[PDB]
Write a protein that binds this ligand. Structure first.
Ligand code: GBM
Length: 488
């Protein structure tokens, strides 16, 4: 009867209208801190530095472009001396700093892979410790860490220090993402649980505009990192004024704290007359009513569903986080491609929302996934001579994958049974990050062929699109109460 208590104190009042906004505001930096290795680690055109013994010193080939490997040993030797990087559009990047060109090309992918590896451990550890210390405490620690370990990376004199600090920043950021929604959805009524779920998505989708503006505003990478990591201190200074969730207090066993929090929120809302009526006995009379992860194993009915759901999550995450990177090579500047990519998610979600309930849950998923897969696989045959279809197909694929993410979230939310839903959603989201981890890993094979990663990126969604035909349709049906009655 917690919902009735919320409607008694006022339900959706000023307390919510302040706290939800002030808790969702810092999510505008997710897009900036996630896809930063497009502006902070761009590769400009470079060539071998001739010896200081002096135009014709390099074996230029492929339409006269200077060659970056050899240096005409005699007026066929490795450089081992240095490179002359261009400074017309990219004054300084990571490759310009430690010379990760033509011999250590895979280290950019390695850094991205480590940054993504530092997301799984966060989502695990700080999700475990969120239900044992308190949402607000963990949020405060996350706010402190994202600024402490994020601003000192801009002064790293070596590569491993930068990698480790980025890993820790991702560790904090993974926890902030989960805890934000976990604390936000608790204070809202049951009838407004889906409205806030879509709110976070559009907040995330707006951060690409800020990234595009800021990157142009400051070209330097150290200053860019400092600026994108600084505001977390301001967000942290105020973060002591939040109110702990009442549901967690009630479930823990301490009802006095729940009572006090209810009175306090009543004072903020201005309904103290009902708070005074609220007492200990009525709470014990109204809330008197108030699953292992291995149960998925040794029970085929849930294992069969979980396997397919995890496969879909993995395929979607792999395709999405392989697509969004490597903006270079499209002919158009990365700055413009950023805003173009950020301008296609809104219509993707808008169209997908209608089609989940109009066409069907599974029809929409299969159509979107197949279209994205074929569109991406098509990109690997047309030559780079073109400059229009290359961008059109990429943006269409990105939007389609965003719509696929919007559809699968609701599909898994409404598919699983009631009691095991909380752990099933977490397990499904867990497999949505291994694909992101492995995305930079398979891009390292670009040395073998110049489009093999692109072919790999299109085969997985195409294969997964035919896998959705093995799940029941559940449109316009009651939520399955339990496993016993779960038959159709
Ligand atoms: C992965 O569960 C979601 C899927 C879609 C949306 Cl709307 C929200 C969530 C969500 O709240 N999960 C819990 C916490 C969370 C949030 C974001 C991320 S994320 O990985 O950094 N974001 C994305 O992948 N895509 C975004 C959203 C969809 C359009 C394109 C941009 C990872 C975890």
């Amino acid at each position: 009867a917690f919902n009735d208590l919320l409607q008694q104190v006022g339900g959706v009042g000023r307390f919510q209208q302040i706290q939800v906004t002030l808790v969702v505001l810092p999510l505008l930096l997710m897009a900036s801190h996630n896809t930063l290795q497009n502006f902070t680690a761009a590769i400009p055109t470079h060539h071998c530095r001739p010896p200081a013994d002096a135009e014709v010193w390099l074996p230029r080939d492929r339409q006269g472009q200077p060659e970056s490997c050899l240096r005409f040993t005699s007026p066929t030797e490795p450089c081992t001396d240095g490179w002359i990087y261009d400074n017309s559009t990219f004054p300084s990047t990571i490759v310009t700093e430690w010379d990760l060109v033509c011999s250590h090309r895979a280290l950019r992918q390695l850094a991205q892979s480590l940054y993504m590896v530092g997301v799984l451990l966060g989502a695990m550890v700080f999700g475990y410790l969120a239900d044992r210390l308190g949402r607000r405490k963990v949020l405060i620690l996350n706010y402190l860490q994202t600024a402490v370990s994020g601003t000192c990376a801009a002064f790293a004199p070596n590569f491993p220090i930068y990698c480790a600090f980025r890993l820790l920043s991702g560790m904090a950021l993974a926890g902030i993402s989960l805890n934000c929604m976990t604390l936000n959805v608790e204070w809202m009524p049951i009838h407004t649980r889906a409205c806030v779920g879509t709110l976070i998505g559009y907040v995330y989708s707006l951060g690409q505009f800020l990234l595009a503006g800021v990157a142009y505003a400051v070209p330097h990478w150290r200053h860019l990192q400092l600026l994108v990591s600084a505001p977390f201190f301001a967000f942290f200074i105020y973060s002591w004024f939040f109110i702990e969730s009442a549901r967690w207090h009630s479930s823990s066993g301490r009802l006095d704290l729940t009572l006090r929090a209810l009175q306090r929120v009543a004072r903020i809302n201005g309904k103290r007359e009902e708070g005074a009526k609220l007492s200990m006995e009525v709470l014990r009379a109204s809330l008197q009513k108030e699953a292992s992860a291995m149960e998925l194993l040794r029970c085929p009915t849930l294992r069969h569903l979980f396997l397919c759901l995890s496969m879909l999550w993995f395929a979607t995450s792999f395709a999405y986080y392989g697509l969004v990177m490597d903006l270079q090579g499209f002919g158009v500047s990365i700055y413009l491609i950023q805003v173009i990519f950020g301008a296609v998610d809104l219509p993707a979600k808008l169209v997908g929302f209608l089609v989940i309930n109009s066409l069907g849950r599974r029809p929409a998923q299969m159509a979107a996934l197949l279209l994205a897969g074929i569109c991406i696989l098509l990109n690997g045959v047309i030559p780079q001579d073109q400059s229009i279809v290359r961008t059109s197909l990429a943006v269409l694929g990105k939007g389609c994958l965003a719509a696929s993410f919007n559809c699968i979230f609701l599909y898994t939310g409404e598919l699983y049974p009631t009691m095991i839903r909380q752990t099933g959603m977490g397990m499904g989201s867990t497999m949505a990050r291994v694909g992101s981890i492995v995305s930079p890993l398979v891009s390292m094979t670009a040395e073998l062929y110049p489009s093999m990663p692109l072919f790999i990126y299109g085969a997985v969604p195409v294969a997964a699109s035919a896998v959705t035909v093995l799940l029941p349709e559940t449109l316009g049906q009651p939520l399955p109460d339990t496993v016993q009655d779960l038959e159709s």
